[PDB]
Amino acid sequence: LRIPCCPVNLKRLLVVVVVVVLVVVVIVGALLMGL
Predict the structure, then answer these.
(1) What residue numbers bound the domain in which 18 lies?
(2) Where is the lipid attached (S-palmitoyl cysteine)?
């Protein structure tokens, strides 16, 4: 329950999520440019 004492591997999971979101934003920008 809660974060233990800073999130463990969950942190790098969050980083992966952020990367995914960034990549999606890149895909969106790319699509807006053309593809």
Answers:
(1) 9-35
(2) 5-6
